């Protein structure tokens, strides 16, 4: 879209009217509407989005996750686009750059950045207000009563829109290192792939000859399998109840699979994992990527006491917003870390991830996650924001299809 | 020892778990027991003193002992090798030893990692028995019948003589021959746990900020470590003002009485308010046993960068603890810790050298209320003075100013 004389763009975006509480439909809350996107201020990028792709956390967001008051909103944190314009103070970006902009920036000067061992930057942390720091939004719409109304972001931006505004301290560019990378690949690099790959590579720090357990092989868990295989793990144990995704995981380098719904009475997933290791010692690295609170506990219990790290990537709407651990196993060697975006720092680590993503085996793995067809640039599960709300609502139901690993939302021509 | 090498001595027997509504008198008694001679690589140890870890009181309440009663209590204590099994190496009769929960085989992938004491080969003896299902301890009951006593784990310390697998023992007498017994006793658990949690596990550096949740003997040992390592800020959280003041005397910079916070202010929010930009602490130590403080310690840590070290224990519903999910995902970093990650061969010799330094010794003396002239501690009971004196001492564990009760077992 071309801006009007005041620099405002009118474009399609996916609006969430309110939380979809249990028993409510997508139809109750989700609608494609025309929105107005204000021009970028200060160090902001306004970004022509190519595609978004559906993270389970996007579905949690529809259900009200981390948004007690921040409706109506434009959804989405997983996506890729092209810089269309920039605020006047912007440095180190140009119009035409291809960017992703995940939740955490990297100031490189706080004690967290300088530690070398985390991406939880003190200066560019999660924008939980879902607003600009002055309480405004670059997004608005004209409702049925003709009134101009504010739309919240997801966090520091929204990706389910033809045009997004994001603070450039959260952006990192793809076009210098990977000018030929297709859009849906760039989209999963913004969250799902970075998360599973980085949880294994950076956070669990998997070494050649390590044993790895992965609880949940959706897009995040399969990304973890691809990393564990690249890093020459001796053993890659995948746990899930979805036989399709367990089989995909086995095709991309998992060595052992466990269907948690088919375990003998009184055999826990952690016991099943331990049974596959020498003297039932457990795994060198335990990844949770399910959102199932039970699996966070089972992941902790699967890890070799003291030596191994359990990396929790999963998210969900839990009773009292709490998770639980078996205390005796926890005290006697538990080691559990929260992980966002795989610990992949947007300046220090993302460039090497992007170079890795171009290696043939890693690309084949991304193609499999996406069911990508390079001839048509279409993914197996794809919906286009220009095709209207009914198509989108059907696609959101089909996220639960057994063979839907990653739904893609096409936003603009490629 | 009799004709068969069996020692008859006093020990503190727990008959059954002390469940809520029961008294110490219901379950705790000083009795004469028989201690068999050591076999294989065992040490039989003349105990000098035990000292009361909060986990000793949890044991009385049934902690980790669903079936392992009756037992001799105790895992914190120090003694002198009286005899050894025929296969023992690297120990002599007369050596002063402690024998904590975890050994250090030095060859398993956990030992070889260099970053944990959770040895795969010498782990916790949860059976509370010898590997053949027998015990070195027994007693003659009122029926005149000979009956087995369980250990605590690999041994019991609340006895004049104990037997332990020498793969769990480490000697005090070469590095610290003049160390008083109660100091050796707290080195075996409380002081190693608090000091190690800060020094080894949280790896506190000069200029770091530290929060310690619970300033009993473990948390005060953590204060001593944080001071020794030149932490910029040492924040202590407790309900007990006497122990908070003691922590401040031994190096703490800021104290918070959790029971005097406004209802809407959490312990983690109070700790973060003491830190620049409410960023929280570089190292967060839980040493309370209060499940709430395990969650608050996790939340007080700088997101991602900092480590929360959980040392606390308790009897929790369904044996489960909980964490606030959003704060956990966005940077939580929590580890279970046993004995301060202090490995009995690689780390304990260094800890023991540290204990001999005047400031650290002064801190151990303050924990103990130790009088060097009388070798008496502020709170001390002798096993030879009878069950009623012990039952009153066990009640006095809860006294405001009781940091560490010592159970004297033999002349020093
Ligand atoms: N931490 C982060 O930065 C980050 C990034 C991506 C996603 N997430 C979260 O991580 C998780 C994985 O993301 P995703 O998009 O791959 O999710 P997904 O829903 O596509 O995949 C999760 C997988 O876990 C399995 N699983 C869920 N509940 C299960 C149960 N009860 N029994 C057995 N298997 C079960 C599912 O069958 C599925 O294969 C989600 O919880 C998501 O919200 C977080
Ligand atoms: N992990 C290990 O190897 C190891 C070693 C020693 C002790 N422990 C455990 O660590 C903890 C500390 O041991 P200790 O012997 O110093 O215990 P302690 O009982 O002497 O001291 C605990 C301190 O925490 C405070 N605390 C407890 N509940 C509180 C609450 N509700 N509000 C505020 N403050 C509270 C108490 O007032 C006290 O000062 C205990 O849970 C003990 O079982 C474990
Ligand atoms: Mg802005
Ligand atoms: Mg033995
Ligand atoms: Zn995501
Ligand atoms: Zn930073
Ligand atoms: Zn103890
Ligand atoms: Zn070992």
PDB file of C-alpha atoms and ligand atoms in Angstrom, chain A residues 41-42 44 132-133 138 167, ligand 3:
ATOM      1  CA  UNK A  41       8.741   8.108  14.823  1.00  0.00           C
ATOM      2  CA  UNK A  42      12.157   8.284  16.584  1.00  0.00           C
ATOM      3  CA  UNK A  44      11.030   3.052  14.524  1.00  0.00           C
ATOM      4  CA  UNK A 132       4.388   2.846  22.586  1.00  0.00           C
ATOM      5  CA  UNK A 133       6.173   4.150  25.719  1.00  0.00           C
ATOM      6  CA  UNK A 138       0.836   3.377  15.555  1.00  0.00           C
ATOM      7  CA  UNK A 167      11.458  -0.058  17.447  1.00  0.00           C
TER       8      UNK A 167
HETATM    9 MG1  LIG C   3       8.204   3.236  19.493  1.00  0.00          MG
END
